[PDB]
Every structure is written in structure tokens, then in C-alpha cells.
Design a protein around this nucleic acid. Structure first.
Ligand SMILES: [Mg+2]
Ligand SMILES: [Mg+2]
Ligand SMILES: [Mg+2]
Ligand SMILES: [Mg+2]
Ligand SMILES: [Mg+2]
Ligand SMILES: [Mg+2]
Ligand SMILES: [Mg+2]
Ligand SMILES: [Mg+2]
Ligand SMILES: [Mg+2]
Ligand SMILES: [Mg+2]
Ligand SMILES: [Mg+2]
Ligand SMILES: [Mg+2]
Ligand SMILES: [Mg+2]
Ligand SMILES: [Mg+2]
Ligand SMILES: [Mg+2]
Ligand SMILES: [Mg+2]
Ligand SMILES: [Mg+2]
Ligand SMILES: [Mg+2]
Ligand SMILES: [Mg+2]
Ligand SMILES: [Mg+2]
Ligand SMILES: [Mg+2]
Ligand SMILES: [Mg+2]
Ligand SMILES: [Mg+2]
Ligand SMILES: [Mg+2]
Ligand SMILES: [Mg+2]
Ligand SMILES: [Mg+2]
Ligand SMILES: [Mg+2]
Ligand SMILES: [Mg+2]
Ligand SMILES: [Mg+2]
Ligand SMILES: [Mg+2]
Ligand SMILES: [Mg+2]
Ligand SMILES: [Mg+2]
Ligand SMILES: [Mg+2]
Ligand SMILES: [Mg+2]
Ligand SMILES: [Mg+2]
Ligand SMILES: [Mg+2]
Ligand SMILES: [Mg+2]
Ligand SMILES: [Mg+2]
Ligand SMILES: [Mg+2]
Ligand SMILES: [Mg+2]
Ligand SMILES: [Mg+2]
Ligand SMILES: [Mg+2]
Ligand SMILES: [Mg+2]
Ligand SMILES: [Mg+2]
Ligand SMILES: [Mg+2]
Ligand SMILES: [Mg+2]
Ligand SMILES: [Mg+2]
Ligand SMILES: [Mg+2]
Ligand SMILES: [Mg+2]
Ligand SMILES: [Mg+2]
Ligand SMILES: [Mg+2]
Ligand SMILES: [Mg+2]
Ligand SMILES: [Mg+2]
Ligand SMILES: [Mg+2]
Ligand SMILES: [Mg+2]
Ligand SMILES: [Mg+2]
Ligand SMILES: [Mg+2]
Ligand SMILES: [Mg+2]
Ligand SMILES: [Mg+2]
Ligand SMILES: [Mg+2]
Ligand SMILES: [Mg+2]
Ligand SMILES: [Mg+2]
Ligand SMILES: [Mg+2]
Ligand SMILES: [Mg+2]
Ligand SMILES: [Mg+2]
Lengths: 204, 159, 137
RNA sequence: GUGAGGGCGCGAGCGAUAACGUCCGCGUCCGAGCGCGGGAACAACCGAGACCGCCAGCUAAGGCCCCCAAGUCUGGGCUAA
RNA sequence: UGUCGGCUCGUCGCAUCCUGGGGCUGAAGAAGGUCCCAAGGGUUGGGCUGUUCGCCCAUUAAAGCGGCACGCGAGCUGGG
RNA sequence: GCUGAAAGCAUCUAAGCGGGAAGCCCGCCCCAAGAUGAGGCCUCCCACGGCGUCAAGCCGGUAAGGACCCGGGAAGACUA
């Protein structure tokens, strides 16, 4: 269960052998192990992977002790990877081979208080004959006296986006260890700078 | 029950013989007597479910014996041109009208044999087992109800 | 004027569950859950005995049940009437089977929920080795 | 004062040996006893006619394993859904 | 207690239109008939009419039936 | 479909056992301990200094650490 952190740096397109392929560019810098939690010490297997460096003054938090507990440069962010205890003290882009497919989770862009139509791509309403009151309007929502209420989770407008989205089976394109870079099949959640994770997909 | 080694437990009976030992889950409210060098069984009453239970264990016990006695073996015939079978060590691979050669796993306590490309016996030590194994084979390619193909036990033709 | 009880110390109890009829057990568990068995009873105060049950999975049940019994779990969502057979419960978290039982037998009142706390259930045995452990049948 | 009555059991017409249907009759309750117990709740089904008090006592219908008062009562049969 | 149809949003039922599995066949094979199991999902665009309904064109795996005050006028329309 | 009695035969069942659905449970994805049944892990700070005889509390100062304010954001009505 391979797992390494990184951030979306941007995306252009390359040329495979004689065909064009849009690809996204992630950056998987060294992620220092911080806490290999075993089932004995917790109940599940995992690894705390750090990331970006830090002004030692900002991390005056007890984090100092946690860092020193493993003896590592104060990173900025660190998360876990379920069922994954590899080796050494650091993971890298060497983990992924050009051909393996990966799952990347990210934080979708926040579309604020988005309208029903924008949100769940509804139909809206007549722009012509109908009263200029319900153009982008959910219209009906329920029934008469029975049931009298609204089905919980009924698609309605509101703050939408800026959440956890997982795209799957993106094939690992050309990976350049020379700079801790990683190329994937393009469509990746999150803006250009969001903290994303890259794991191992489930084809079989 | 000759040359057998029937040994009684609380809710089960362990029978041993030339072929080996085998466990047979015996009903609760039944008396598994062991008179002389043979075995007897009685029932606590004369009701409906108890008649059934008795006769059930009655044979079920005789099966454990025969199982480690002379053993169990059923035969399998095969009709049709390409319809054949090639024994491969334990498991047996037989092409019987499918683009993919059929690979048949050999369960424990069972060793089907192949004297001919058509005939295939089913050696074992348990009726429940041989019973399923035999069916498992016919299940692969049931007989063509319009002529002669597929794998048969040894019973009449479907015509 | 009828006796006016005061603060009473929690009398814990250790009860089995092997080969025990789900219902016949829970009944007593409830009966004794509240101080209903102690002649110094008082509905107002709520001073029941801390009942702890062990060997949950062991519980016996009659007829189809295992295959028949069905539990109802309705989330507030459309088609969320998700229901679970008895067996499944014995597979997942078996302790529930007795819980929901006793649960349904304690008074619907808010102090009944307070009595539900006085009810600890596992299957091992092996309880949280505290102190009290008055075995019973 | 009243001159819309209603439910119910029973005997009949109409209805379709339909209707919380309808139209007479004999009685009954509700009406006006939505006061109490039972029936999960419930005008009329079962019990029973509230002058006021009481931290007494038997019983009615129903009920006596837990929510729930009071038998996991006693003895003898049937039923595995 | 706003009354058709339309729009918008659906959700539930199963007596299933499709896809799933299965029995029988007057089932060679293909294709089909009929019955049983089975809602998880799906179940088109258009001509005419206010229409529902239906007829028709082209296609479709199929172009399902019905409940929700024949769902929905403090959501819309207003042809009826 | 197996073993198989009731019911010497027979039978897929009455004990038991196997195979078998786009369905169910799990698996995938998302929320999630207000799971008041408030879970777990790693790390940081630690005494009352004074009344309260007890029990139940209060007070000014602190620690780790947080808040306010300010510049600002693919985050955003507001707040977060
Ligand atoms: Mg936008
Ligand atoms: Mg859009
Ligand atoms: Mg959209
Ligand atoms: Mg939609
Ligand atoms: Mg539209
Ligand atoms: Mg208008
Ligand atoms: Mg106008
Ligand atoms: Mg207007
Ligand atoms: Mg309305
Ligand atoms: Mg002997
Ligand atoms: Mg004999
Ligand atoms: Mg069973
Ligand atoms: Mg079972
Ligand atoms: Mg669902
Ligand atoms: Mg209340
Ligand atoms: Mg008059
Ligand atoms: Mg009459
Ligand atoms: Mg009238
Ligand atoms: Mg009348
Ligand atoms: Mg009258
Ligand atoms: Mg009166
Ligand atoms: Mg009167
Ligand atoms: Mg009167
Ligand atoms: Mg009143
Ligand atoms: Mg009553
Ligand atoms: Mg009453
Ligand atoms: Mg008096
Ligand atoms: Mg009395
Ligand atoms: Mg009585
Ligand atoms: Mg009662
Ligand atoms: Mg009796
Ligand atoms: Mg829609
Ligand atoms: Mg749905
Ligand atoms: Mg079919
Ligand atoms: Mg068919
Ligand atoms: Mg055929
Ligand atoms: Mg033909
Ligand atoms: Mg659904
Ligand atoms: Mg149109
Ligand atoms: Mg037109
Ligand atoms: Mg035209
Ligand atoms: Mg027109
Ligand atoms: Mg039209
Ligand atoms: Mg027509
Ligand atoms: Mg056509
Ligand atoms: Mg509908
Ligand atoms: Mg309508
Ligand atoms: Mg309407
Ligand atoms: Mg309107
Ligand atoms: Mg309308
Ligand atoms: Mg309305
Ligand atoms: Mg006009
Ligand atoms: Mg007109
Ligand atoms: Mg007109
Ligand atoms: Mg047969
Ligand atoms: Mg027989
Ligand atoms: Mg037979
Ligand atoms: Mg047969
Ligand atoms: Mg039968
Ligand atoms: Mg399946
Ligand atoms: Mg499947
Ligand atoms: Mg689920
Ligand atoms: Mg002091
Ligand atoms: Mg204090
Ligand atoms: Mg602050």
C-alpha cells in the first residue's frame, strides 16, 4: 500500500511515443517518517509522513518533542497512510514506477454558496414564457400532506465544494527523481498548491 | 462392522479402519451402543421426528464404517467427439466443448481416477464427499437432452 | 409517612449468560437493574444494582429466531430502513443482542437510560476487573 | 325546554344477505356520564352511576415475565408456524 | 382544502419494460413462448392535439405499470 | 444437487452439507466520538500563593497554549 504526500504544481501535456497525453504535475518531496503506529501501540498500521520545512520558531509547539521523538527537521504538514510500513526513514518518488496506477485525494476548489443549478447541475426553468421568478429555481421539493416533510439530504443550494475528493486509477507517467517530481493522467482535484496524497489504486 | 474401530464420544462417533479415521456428527438424544464388536443405536421414544432421527443415524453410522472399510468410488461416462478428459497428476483437465480447458481441483480425502479418456472413477472415503464430487462433474457439462454429449454417471441416456 | 430512603452504595452483580434464554435473562437483569428487588424500592431516586453480564455470545434462543429475528435500524434518510438479522448481530457486536433486549425492558423514562448505564455487557468472560463481583444465576 | 339525533344488539324494508349507507320497530348507552377502570390510544364494546375528605380494607372488567400492580403458580393435553 | 395538462424536483411500491438468474417448452441452434426469483440502476428525441389518452416518424437493451390530495400553483406556467 | 430417514423402496430436508442472482452484507468513495456509550495515540506545561475546620467554592497571578488586532487567501454572504 504505497503512499506519499505532495502538492499540485500545475499541468501541461507531453507526447508519449507518438501520441499526445495531457498530464498533471505533482511534487513528492521527501516525507520523513514520524510515527510508525503498530496495532500494539494503537490498533491499526500506519505511518506519519511529514513534508515542507519550517521556521523552527513557528513550531515552538509541543510538536518540537514529537519531531525530536524521531529526530527530524520540523516539517509543516503530516498525515497517515493506513496499512503501510515500508523501510528507511523517508519515502520518495522512487516508490512509484511509470506504469503503476495511483489514487490521489485532494481538496476541491470552494465554490462558496453555490446555486442549486450550479451545484447539482439541475435543469432550472423556462427563460421565456414562464414568470421571471424561477429561472434557476429547484421548483418543487415535496408532496401534499403526505408525507408533509422533506427527504433528508434533498439536493438544495448552498456552500458547495472545498471538500475531500478522491480520483482513481490515474496512471503514473514519466517520474523524474532528479527533482522529486511526479507526472499523472491529468485530472487531479485541488488547486495549484493543495496538499494531496497519492496511494495505490484497486484494479484487483 | 468387522476389523473396524468405532469409538463413541458425547455427541459424535469416531470410526477408524484400514483407510483411516473419520468423524461423524452424531445426534444428541441418541444412544450409540457398542455391543460386542458391532454397534447399535436406539431412540428415547416412538414419535415422528425420532423415527426419522433413528433411521438417519442408523445409516449415517453404517456409512462411517463402510467409508473406512472398502471405500467409496463412483464412475463417470463421457459422450461426444472432442468430449474427453486428461488426468493431470492430482487435478484433472478435461475439454468438453468449451474454449477454456476445465481444471478440476482435487479436494482432500478424494482422488478421482482416469482409466480411459471417457471413464472417470471417483475414489474417496465419504459418501457426502463422493456424492458432491460426482455431481460436481456432471454439473460441469450436463448431458445434451437432444443427443449424446456431456458427462454421465452411468445411468440411462437422456435420449 | 412511608419510608424515605437515602443515599445507597452501588451493589454490583456478576451474572452469567451461557445457555441462558435471551428473554428469561434480560427480565431479571431489568428487574434487578432497578432496585425493584430490594424491599427499600423507590422510583424517584433510581438506585438500581450495577449489573454486569459476561458470555454474551453464549446466549441461547428458541425456534427460528437466529434466522427469523430481525432488528430495525431506521436512519432519517429515504430508504434507510436498513435491517439486520439475528445471526449478523452475533457476528458483528453480539453484546448488542442482550443490550437492546434489556434496553427495551427498562422504563422509557430518562432515569431508565440512567439505569442502562448500570448495565455492562461483554463476552469472554473477563470483566473490567474493578472490585465487586457477586456472582449469581 | 325539545320537534337535525347517534352508535350499539336484536327483528325487517331499501341496498348488492355493500357502506362509520339508509328507513321503522324493541331495548340499551352516548347525548347530558369526553367523570373513573379495562380495551395501546378511542362519545357510545366490557366494569361501574364521581356529595367532600383519608398515605385504610375486599372486589368488578381485565389482568398477574419486563416497560406495569399482582404467579416466570399448580396439574393434565395440543400446536413448531 | 385552488381545480386539467405542462414544467421543475423527485421519492416509494412491484403485480418487472430493460439488463441479472432460473424452471418448463409443441426448447436443434439462433430467436422466441410461458411461469418463478429479482428494483440496484436504467427506462430516448420528435410530428398532431390544451390535452391526459392515443396515433404516427426515427431509434432503442427497454422505450414498465401504479402510489404520494390521479405528488408538487406560499416552486412556475395558465393553452384547457 | 448431495448424503438421507420418516416410509426396508423412494425423496434436495425432516439433522446436517455444497453450488447459485445487476439483489443483501462487506469491499470503493464521502461525513463521522454531541458515538453526554463523548473513544485511542504521540508530545508539551504542572502544584495553593490565601480564606473554606469538613463537604461544596471563590480570588489576583502563572505555565504549556489560545484569543484580540493587523496584511492577506483558488477559503468565504456572515462567521468559520
Ligand atoms: Mg464557480
Ligand atoms: Mg457547472
Ligand atoms: Mg456539476
Ligand atoms: Mg438529477
Ligand atoms: Mg430544461
Ligand atoms: Mg407570467
Ligand atoms: Mg405579469
Ligand atoms: Mg410575481
Ligand atoms: Mg400544495
Ligand atoms: Mg466394546
Ligand atoms: Mg448393526
Ligand atoms: Mg439451517
Ligand atoms: Mg446457516
Ligand atoms: Mg443506498
Ligand atoms: Mg413525561
Ligand atoms: Mg320541524
Ligand atoms: Mg337490516
Ligand atoms: Mg344520515
Ligand atoms: Mg346511521
Ligand atoms: Mg335508538
Ligand atoms: Mg347522561
Ligand atoms: Mg339518561
Ligand atoms: Mg344515563
Ligand atoms: Mg376535555
Ligand atoms: Mg382505557
Ligand atoms: Mg375510556
Ligand atoms: Mg365517601
Ligand atoms: Mg383486595
Ligand atoms: Mg380474571
Ligand atoms: Mg400486563
Ligand atoms: Mg402445562
Ligand atoms: Mg430530474
Ligand atoms: Mg435513489
Ligand atoms: Mg433469462
Ligand atoms: Mg427463459
Ligand atoms: Mg438446449
Ligand atoms: Mg427451431
Ligand atoms: Mg438506493
Ligand atoms: Mg416536446
Ligand atoms: Mg413543434
Ligand atoms: Mg410545425
Ligand atoms: Mg399543439
Ligand atoms: Mg403536448
Ligand atoms: Mg387515437
Ligand atoms: Mg416506430
Ligand atoms: Mg411517478
Ligand atoms: Mg394534481
Ligand atoms: Mg398541481
Ligand atoms: Mg401559481
Ligand atoms: Mg397543475
Ligand atoms: Mg402549496
Ligand atoms: Mg395572459
Ligand atoms: Mg387556444
Ligand atoms: Mg376559452
Ligand atoms: Mg438426480
Ligand atoms: Mg432410503
Ligand atoms: Mg434418493
Ligand atoms: Mg430429481
Ligand atoms: Mg416439506
Ligand atoms: Mg453477486
Ligand atoms: Mg456477480
Ligand atoms: Mg453500506
Ligand atoms: Mg489553602
Ligand atoms: Mg472545585
Ligand atoms: Mg489569536
Amino acid at each position: 500500500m504505497k503512499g506519499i504526500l505532495g502538492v499540485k504544481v500545475g499541468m501541461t501535456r507531453i507526447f508519449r511515443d507518438d501520441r499526445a497525453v495531457p498530464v498533471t504535475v505533482i511534487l513528492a518531496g521527501p516525507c520523513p517518517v514520524v510515527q510508525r503506529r503498530t496495532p500494539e501501540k494503537d490498533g491499526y498500521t500506519a505511518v506519519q509522513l511529514g513534508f515542507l520545512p519550517q521556521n523552527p520558531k513557528r513550531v515552538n509547539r509541543p510538536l518540537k518533542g514529537h519531531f525530536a521523538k524521531a529526530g527530524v527537521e520540523p516539517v509543516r504538514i503530516l498525515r497517515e497512510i493506513r496499512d503501510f510500513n515500508p523501510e528507511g526513514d523517508t519515502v520518495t518518488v522512487e516508490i512509484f514506477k511509470p506504469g503503476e496506477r495511483v489514487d490521489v485525494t485532494g481538496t476541491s476548489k470552494g465554490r462558496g454558496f453555490a446555486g442549486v443549478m450550479k451545484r447539482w447541475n439541475f435543469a432550472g426553468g423556462p427563460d421565456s414564457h414562464g414568470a421571471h421568478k424561477i429561472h434557476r429555481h429547484p421548483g418543487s421539493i415535496g408532496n401534499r400532506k403526505t408525507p408533509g416533510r422533506v427527504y433528508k439530504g434533498k439536493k438544495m443550494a448552498g456552500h458547495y465544494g472545498a471538500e475531500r475528493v478522491t480520483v482513481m486509477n490515474l496512471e503514473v507517467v514519466d517520474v523524474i527523481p532528479e527533482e522529486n517530481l511526479l507526472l499523472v493522467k491529468g485530472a487531479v482535484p485541488g488547486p495549484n498548491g493543495g496538499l494531496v496524497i497519492v496511494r495505490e489504486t484497486k484494479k484487483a | 462392522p468387522k476389523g473396524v474401530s468405532v469409538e463413541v464420544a458425547p455427541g459424535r462417533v469416531k470410526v477408524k479402519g484400514p483407510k483411516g479415521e473419520l468423524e461423524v456428527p452424531v445426534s444428541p438424544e441418541m444412544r450409540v451402543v457398542v455391543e460386542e464388536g458391532v454397534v447399535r443405536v436406539e431412540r428415547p421414544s416412538d414419535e415422528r421426528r425420532h423415527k426419522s432421527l433413528h433411521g438417519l443415524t442408523r445409516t449415517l453410522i453404517a456409512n462411517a464404517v463402510k467409508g473406512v472399510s472398502e471405500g467409496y468410488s463412483k464412475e463417470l461416462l463421457i459422450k461426444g467427439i472432442g468430449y474427453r478428459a486428461r488426468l493431470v497428476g492430482r487435478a484433472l483437465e478435461l475439454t468438453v466443448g468449451f474454449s477454456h480447458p476445465v481444471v478440476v481441483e482435487p479436494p482432500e480425502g478424494i482422488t478421482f481416477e482416469v482409466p480411459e479418456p471417457t471413464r472417470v472413477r471417483v475414489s474417496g472415503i465419504d459418501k457426502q464427499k463422493v456424492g458432491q464430487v460426482a455431481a460436481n462433474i456432471r454439473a460441469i457439462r450436463k448431458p445434451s437432452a437432444y443427443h449424446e454429449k456431456g458427462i454421465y454417471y452411468a445411468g440411462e441416456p437422456v435420449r | 409517612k412511608t419510608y424515605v430512603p437515602k443515599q445507597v452504595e452501588p451493589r454490583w452483580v456478576l451474572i452469567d449468560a451461557e445457555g441462558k434464554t435471551l428473554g428469561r435473562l434480560a427480565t431479571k437483569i431489568a428487574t434487578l437493574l432497578r432496585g425493584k428487588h430490594r424491599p427499600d424500592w423507590t422510583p424517584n431516586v433510581a438506585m438500581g444494582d450495577f449489573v454486569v453480564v459476561v458470555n454474551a455470545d453464549k446466549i441461547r434462543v428458541t425456534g427460528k429466531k437466529l434466522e427469523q429475528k430481525i432488528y430495525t435500524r431506521y436512519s432519517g434518510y429515504p430508504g434507510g430502513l436498513k435491517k439486520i438479522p439475528l445471526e449478523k448481530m452475533l457476528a458483528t457486536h453480539p453484546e448488542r443482542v442482550l443490550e437492546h433486549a434489556v434496553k427495551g425492558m427498562l422504563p422509557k423514562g430518562p432515569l431508565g437510560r440512567r439505569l442502562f448505564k448500570r448495565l455492562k455487557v461483554y463476552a469472554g468472560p473477563d470483566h473490567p476487573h474493578q472490585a465487586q463481583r457477586p456472582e449469581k444465576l
